């Protein structure tokens, strides 16, 4: 009972044409494409009540749509533009059944104006202050992830193999490294906190992980820096006496 959308993040270029897949394994009759934008909520672009059939939503302009198969429902942007940058959300419903819409996870698109200036993040970890242990019996690590564009990171903390829920806080939204630059690089902070003892142990491994979601294999460049693909950049850490 599930609805995937082929890509979860995408970087595309002002002008470049863009395909977004959407696919369901429920033999469902109606599928929809919305975009979600901050302030505007969900806005329906296009829909389909059966195979081959398209119909326009409230905002179909410079969007086009395909339904060759019952499983599928592709969105097409023709010339991609900067305000077609957004979060694209696929949904499917059955006509018989009483069970309503089933959403996908999303695909986040970023359109960028005459150039790819996409760099992974560098990721420094930092270790807790002497004073904090003593004063508060607690111990806060800080992870900064820095120097990335566009805003496509997913920052996780890891302790001794398994990931960690608790004592964590990542910035809801990042901040611009230079509020001058139009397409300015970005940066994000997170904190993991723990008890003094837990930190005072070199049997405790502390890794801060960030996943960039950047360029793909069939993307075109070769300038003098690495291919900024969808890698994981970690920093790691080790407790102290």
């Amino acid at each position: 009972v599930k609805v995937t959308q082929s890509s979860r993040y995408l970087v595309k270029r002002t002008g470049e044409k863009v395909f977004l897949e959407c696919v369901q394994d429920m033999d469902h009759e109606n599928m929809f494409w919305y975009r979600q934008d901050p302030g505007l909520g969900l806005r329906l672009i296009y829909f389909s009540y059966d195979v081959k059939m398209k119909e326009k939503g409230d905002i179909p302009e410079g969007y086009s749509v395909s339904r060759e198969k019952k499983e599928r429902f592709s969105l097409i942007l023709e010339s991609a533009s900067t305000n077609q940058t957004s979060m694209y959300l696929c949904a499917s419903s059955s006509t018989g059944l009483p069970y309503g819409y089933t959403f996908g996870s999303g695909t986040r698109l970023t359109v960028v104006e005459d150039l790819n200036k996409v760099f992974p993040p560098e990721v420094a970890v930092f270790e807790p202050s002497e004073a904090e242990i003593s004063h508060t019996q607690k111990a806060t690590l800080v992870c900064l992830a820095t120097g990335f564009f566009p805003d496509h990171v997913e920052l996780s903390w890891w302790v001794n193999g398994k990931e960690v829920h608790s004592g964590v806080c990542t910035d809801p939204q990042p901040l611009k490294e230079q509020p001058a630059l139009n397409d300015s690089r970005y940066s994000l902070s997170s904190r993991l906190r723990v008890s003094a003892t837990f930190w005072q142990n070199p049997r405790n491994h502390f890794r801060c992980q960030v996943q960039f979601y950047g360029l793909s294999e069939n993307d075109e460049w070769t300038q003098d820096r690495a291919k900024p693909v969808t890698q994981i950049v970690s920093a790691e850490a080790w407790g102290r006496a």
């Binding site: 109606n30 909520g41 806060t140 800080v142 004592g167």
Partner: protein, 202 residues
């Protein structure tokens, strides 16, 4: 069904307080109404639906909304805010009963809960690691919800918003904000100075 408004797109309530999110609709025909929640790293989910079976609808994660035809409103409430409840919330309306024909959504409402910081002692610490990058960062932690962290005066110093961590087993929650530069002439006596509390360890 053709419409929905969600008056008040941001809302901030202290944990324990009433949550109340608004939703009115305009409808040429008998409307079926819906409520979606979107927790941070997640797709939409259904809190509750109105299919004309009864007027006061009970939902999930503690929520409730009364359909009033009188005034064309399906407002959403929970009488006691949990921290868990911080999300964008979405009203929607359809023409057919289970959600089968298209849905028109509202612009949405981002609910913010403010933690009850029981024993605050504000402090500003300094952390270092020179392994990834020679850099220094200053942690303004353990301060309390009244206080807010104002943005930098200096261009080349980086200060982020506040943020609440919560350590399950120790019933403990704490605010925290992060500040940094590469600049040699920056220290954590410089860093957070703007409307910071007047009694913090150094």
């Amino acid at each position: 069904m053709q419409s929905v408004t969600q008056l008040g797109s941001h809302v901030s309530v202290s944990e324990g307080a009433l949550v109340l999110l608004r939703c009115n609709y305009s409808s040429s025909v008998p409307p079926y109404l819906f409520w979606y929640v979107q927790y941070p790293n997640q797709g939409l989910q259904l809190l509750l639906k109105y299919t004309s079976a009864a007027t006061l609808v009970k939902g999930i994660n503690g929520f409730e909304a009364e359909f009033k035809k009188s005034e064309t409103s399906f407002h959403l409430t929970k009488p006691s805010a949990h921290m868990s409840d911080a999300a964008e919330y979405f009203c929607a309306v359809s023409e057919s009963p289970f959600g089968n024909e298209k849905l028109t959504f509202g612009t949405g409402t981002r609910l913010t809960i403010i933690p009850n910081i029981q024993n605050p002692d504000p402090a500003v610490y300094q952390l270092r690691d020179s392994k990834s990058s020679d850099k220094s960062v200053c942690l303004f932690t353990d301060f309390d919800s009244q206080t807010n962290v104002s943005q930098s005066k200096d261009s080349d110093v980086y200060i982020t918003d506040k943020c609440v961590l919560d350590m399950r087993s120790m019933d403990f929650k704490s605010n925290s904000a992060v500040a940094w530069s590469n600049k040699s002439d920056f220290a954590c006596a410089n860093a957070f100075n703007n409307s910071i509390i007047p009694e913090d360890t150094f």
